[PDB]
Design an enzyme around this catalytic site. Structure first.
Site, mmCIF file in Angstrom:
data_model
loop_
_atom_site.group_PDB
_atom_site.id
_atom_site.type_symbol
_atom_site.label_atom_id
_atom_site.label_comp_id
_atom_site.label_asym_id
_atom_site.label_seq_id
_atom_site.Cartn_x
_atom_site.Cartn_y
_atom_site.Cartn_z
ATOM 1 N N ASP A 92 0.850 -1.183 0.000
ATOM 2 C CA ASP A 92 0.000 0.000 0.000
ATOM 3 C C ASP A 92 0.893 1.243 0.000
ATOM 4 O O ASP A 92 2.065 1.191 0.377
ATOM 5 C CB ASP A 92 -0.964 0.002 1.190
ATOM 6 C CG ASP A 92 -2.160 0.931 0.974
ATOM 7 O OD1 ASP A 92 -2.276 1.540 -0.112
ATOM 8 O OD2 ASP A 92 -3.003 1.004 1.889
ATOM 9 N N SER A 93 0.334 2.357 -0.474
ATOM 10 C CA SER A 93 1.105 3.535 -0.869
ATOM 11 C C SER A 93 1.283 4.559 0.244
ATOM 12 O O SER A 93 2.043 5.521 0.076
ATOM 13 C CB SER A 93 0.400 4.233 -2.026
ATOM 14 O OG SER A 93 -0.916 4.543 -1.599
ATOM 15 N N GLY A 94 0.616 4.379 1.370
ATOM 16 C CA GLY A 94 0.674 5.305 2.471
ATOM 17 C C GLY A 94 -0.532 6.207 2.594
ATOM 18 O O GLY A 94 -0.755 6.764 3.674
ATOM 19 N N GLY A 95 -1.334 6.321 1.531
ATOM 20 C CA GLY A 95 -2.387 7.327 1.484
ATOM 21 C C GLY A 95 -3.442 7.154 2.559
ATOM 22 O O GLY A 95 -3.973 8.139 3.081
ATOM 23 N N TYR A 96 -3.758 5.908 2.901
ATOM 24 C CA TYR A 96 -4.742 5.568 3.921
ATOM 25 C C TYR A 96 -4.130 5.571 5.316
ATOM 26 O O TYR A 96 -4.669 6.209 6.224
ATOM 27 C CB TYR A 96 -5.342 4.199 3.594
ATOM 28 C CG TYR A 96 -6.206 3.593 4.681
ATOM 29 C CD1 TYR A 96 -5.656 2.773 5.662
ATOM 30 C CD2 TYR A 96 -7.564 3.816 4.712
ATOM 31 C CE1 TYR A 96 -6.431 2.225 6.648
ATOM 32 C CE2 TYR A 96 -8.360 3.249 5.688
ATOM 33 C CZ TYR A 96 -7.792 2.456 6.657
ATOM 34 O OH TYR A 96 -8.573 1.898 7.645
ATOM 35 N N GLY A 220 -11.625 3.460 -0.713
ATOM 36 C CA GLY A 220 -12.667 4.243 -0.073
ATOM 37 C C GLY A 220 -13.767 3.437 0.575
ATOM 38 O O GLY A 220 -14.777 4.022 0.986
ATOM 39 N N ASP A 270 -7.187 -8.057 0.928
ATOM 40 C CA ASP A 270 -6.278 -8.093 2.076
ATOM 41 C C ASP A 270 -7.049 -7.664 3.313
ATOM 42 O O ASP A 270 -7.956 -6.838 3.226
ATOM 43 C CB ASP A 270 -5.112 -7.111 1.917
ATOM 44 C CG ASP A 270 -5.528 -5.668 2.175
ATOM 45 O OD1 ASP A 270 -6.093 -5.037 1.254
ATOM 46 O OD2 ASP A 270 -5.311 -5.184 3.307
ATOM 47 N N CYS A 308 -10.734 -28.583 8.261
ATOM 48 C CA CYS A 308 -9.536 -27.843 7.888
ATOM 49 C C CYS A 308 -8.313 -28.745 7.765
ATOM 50 O O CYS A 308 -8.062 -29.613 8.605
ATOM 51 C CB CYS A 308 -9.300 -26.773 8.949
ATOM 52 S SG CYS A 308 -7.806 -25.789 8.704
ATOM 53 N N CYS A 310 -5.133 -27.695 7.805
ATOM 54 C CA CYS A 310 -3.905 -27.020 8.213
ATOM 55 C C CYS A 310 -3.147 -27.855 9.257
ATOM 56 O O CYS A 310 -3.690 -28.769 9.885
ATOM 57 C CB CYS A 310 -4.205 -25.604 8.732
ATOM 58 S SG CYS A 310 -4.561 -25.421 10.518
ATOM 59 N N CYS A 313 -4.662 -27.987 12.844
ATOM 60 C CA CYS A 313 -5.799 -28.877 13.013
ATOM 61 C C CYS A 313 -5.409 -30.340 12.880
ATOM 62 O O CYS A 313 -6.150 -31.202 13.355
ATOM 63 C CB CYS A 313 -6.897 -28.479 12.029
ATOM 64 S SG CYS A 313 -7.638 -26.865 12.457
ATOM 65 N N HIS A 339 -3.760 -21.237 11.649
ATOM 66 C CA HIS A 339 -5.047 -21.800 11.280
ATOM 67 C C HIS A 339 -5.916 -20.769 10.554
ATOM 68 O O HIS A 339 -6.536 -21.073 9.527
ATOM 69 C CB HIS A 339 -5.792 -22.341 12.496
ATOM 70 C CG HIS A 339 -7.231 -22.546 12.204
ATOM 71 N ND1 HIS A 339 -7.695 -23.635 11.491
ATOM 72 C CD2 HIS A 339 -8.284 -21.719 12.372
ATOM 73 C CE1 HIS A 339 -8.997 -23.507 11.318
ATOM 74 N NE2 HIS A 339 -9.380 -22.357 11.849
HETATM 75 ZN ZN LIG Z 1 -6.851 -25.445 10.823
#
Ligand SMILES: [Zn+2]
Ligand SMILES: CO[C@@H]1O[C@H](CNc2nc3cc4c(=O)[nH]c(N)nc4cc3[nH]2)[C@@H](O)[C@H]1O
Ligand SMILES: CO[C@@H]1O[C@H](CNc2nc3cc4c(=O)[nH]c(N)nc4cc3[nH]2)[C@@H](O)[C@H]1O
Ligand SMILES: [Cl-]
Ligand SMILES: [Cl-]
Ligand SMILES: [Zn+2]
Lengths: 373, 373
Positions: A92-96, A220, A270, A308, A310, A313, A339
């Site tokens: 991100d560019s910094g604007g926010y 925005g 994101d 899940c 992962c 889990c 997770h």
């Molecule tokens: Zn998991």
């Protein structure tokens, strides 16, 4: 490998699935980017981020210019080498973030002067400086320097804000194109503004398309408007952007926000939710979120989520993770975060597969019926 | 696999190297045990603990009986299953931690009543209850319930304290032997007391040897006496213990403390220093400890240590870890901890190899000359 090549493999309604090929890797879309603000996805090694399925992570110009510094990162070999992530990074560019986190700001046509939230020292951002910082970091996807209009805004204030952002978008384009190594190896995305107003969103899309970008973000939003209004704005805003380039919804979101945004033509996302709320004890499951600290989990031997795949889990129980989080143990933050990011990646995979197979409408319906039961 | 079998493969002076074979794995000696007080080695997954070279970890009766509770851990399948570490675990018996951490205690011949440091609730420890808790946890090496005499102590107060510990050692032996499953699958270590007094250390060794244990700890040290005095006491105390069983120095220590203790016949060690000081920014190197937060590391691309084989030193720079720790990032704690535990394990490996090869004297001299340069 290509600098930047987007290919749409399949569509269903407004939803698309495909790939962005870049020099440092392929990005499968729709894509979720874990957030790595301070040159780390909090509580995860980069290899663990990759093991969850992430193709690309997000960094922040604002945070990194303050600490450790952009010139310092460049001297140390760039952000990828510094943090040990060799795949694409979007910054991100910094604007926010400058307007969200700075204690004092001065806004003008040139840019934004501000006091750091860390120590009060004075700094400057502008289209040219933002692009330079992102060059020094070695970003793969560079965001234009913009202004995220506060919500709510009057039509006239939204219009003047959006018009400044469009002038800054042209300055961002020119600064990026001037830096031959950046233009050869990175991509540049523009950011649509216009608050909740259809005519302003159209004027912003037209201005960005005239300049030309590799991708187009919807800026925005995720500024307090709520899901109904965000979806209403997406309904008309996304079709205004060029169809043949990626569409990136900044800062979104909860799982149902992602599904609905994909139904409206968004390709990239994101959000801090999986990482931040993971550390706070919230785990995502296909039956909705759970608060692992709740007493009902103290003797629950099941994994966080029953389906899940992962590593968390596969190995540890709710009861153990409940103990870790209640005790303030770092391993609790680590396991919850892995997770949650894995869950987000599995959601994106199911979205991609269902669009490719022409059954995304049914997937969205089944997802909601179970998640909100 | 054997319940417990100690074999000395080589000796040099008072130093020994060999193996303890147990049902859940082999322990190479001299051994360093990472500390896992609350059912986690702080900031590390168990697989990472193993990757550093650790053969065995330490847990604590006192902490685990308070949170999550011993009966709860047993209901969930035991400590090994709960935390995901399938190799040997040694548990301290509570005798030291209750007096170190409790806000209020009542000591008697029966045991110790105390108020929890977490919420003030009232609890009890005794030889019988400590052994029962360690049974419920599923410890592989069970420590006798003892009293760590404060330092300094008068000879007479040290004597009466040591005598209580020896009566508690017999009660610990009997409680352990009564529990058939524990006696078949675990080992029991006695703890020598006697403060800094040779005659009391002899009386304590004689009492423990008459009862008979699988191993013998030197208790009552690392309580503020300093290295010179600790080494003086070890000089006469370790030879009093049975030669054919392991010798365990509780709570020690810094790298030079470990080397000197091995020179005096110690086989086993545990200490919070690598984990705790790692999180605080102290990294161990062969040239001595460094404070990674110091400004001199802000642009240092070298690994934490130039020879270390750990995953952290293969991938990340001092400069990156400096940034992480200064920013309060969890990954900083993770990486510092993995390196420090790996360094401790590499020290133990060099100790074992040098004893086996009959060059430990030279190793100790070379180690000190460089570490303290
Ligand atoms: Zn998991
Ligand atoms: O919901 C909450 O809101 C935050 C994220 N929302 C968000 N909206 C954004 C908009 C923009 C934009 O217009 N421009 C640029 N450059 N970056 C942006 C970044 C954004 N992030 C989180 O706190 C989330 O929990
Ligand atoms: O040096 C500091 O001191 C602490 C560790 N010192 C220590 N001495 C111990 C003695 C005993 C004992 O006599 N009995 C039992 N049961 N457990 C023990 C555990 C011990 N731990 C750390 O804070 C270290 O930094
Ligand atoms: Cl976060
Ligand atoms: Cl610790
Ligand atoms: Zn290392």
């Amino acid at each position: 490998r290509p600098r930047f090549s987007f290919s749409i493999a399949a569509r269903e309604g407004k939803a698309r699935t495909g790939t962005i090929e870049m020099k440092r890797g392929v990005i499968r879309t729709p894509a979720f980017m874990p957030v790595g603000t301070a040159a780390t996805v909090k509580a995860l090694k980069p290899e663990t981020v990759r093991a969850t399925g992430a193709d690309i992570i997000l960094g922040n110009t604002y945070h990194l210019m303050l600490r450790p510094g952009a010139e310092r990162i460049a001297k140390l070999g760039g952000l990828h080498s510094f943090m040990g992530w060799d795949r694409p990074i979007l910054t991100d560019s910094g604007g926010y973030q400058v307007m969200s986190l700075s204690s004092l700001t001065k806004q003008s046509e040139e840019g934004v002067t501000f006091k750091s939230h860390l120590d009060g020292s004075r700094h400057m951002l502008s289209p040219e400086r933002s692009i330079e910082i992102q060059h020094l970091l070695g970003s793969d996807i560079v965001m234009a320097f913009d202004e995220c209009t506060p919500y709510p805004a009057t039509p006239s204030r939204a219009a003047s804000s959006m018009e400044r952002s469009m002038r800054w978008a042209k300055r961002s384009r020119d600064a990026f194109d001037s830096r031959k190594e950046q233009a050869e190896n990175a991509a540049l995305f523009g950011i649509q503004q216009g608050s909740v107003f259809e005519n302003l969103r159209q004027q912003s899309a037209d201005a960005l398309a005239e300049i030309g970008f590799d991708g187009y973000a919807v800026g925005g939003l995720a500024v307090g408007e709520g899901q109904d209004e965000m979806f209403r704005v997406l309904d008309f805003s996304v079709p205004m952007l060029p169809d043949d380039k990626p569409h990136y919804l900044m800062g979104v979101g909860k799982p149902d926000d992602i599904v609905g945004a994909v139904e409206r033509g968004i390709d990239m996302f994101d959000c801090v939710l999986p990482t931040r709320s993971g550390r706070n004890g919230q785990a995502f499951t296909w039956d909705g979120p759970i608060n692992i600290r709740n007493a009902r989990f103290s003797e629950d031997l099941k994994p966080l989520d029953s389906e899940c795949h992962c590593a968390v889990c596969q190995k540890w129980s709710r009861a153990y993770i409940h103990h870790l989080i209640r005790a303030g143990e770092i391993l609790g933050a680590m396991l919850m975060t892995e997770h949650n990011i894995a869950f987000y990646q599995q959601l994106m995979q199911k979205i991609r597969d269902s669009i490719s197979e022409g059954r995304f409408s049914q997937f969205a319906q089944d997802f909601r019926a179970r998640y909100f039961a």
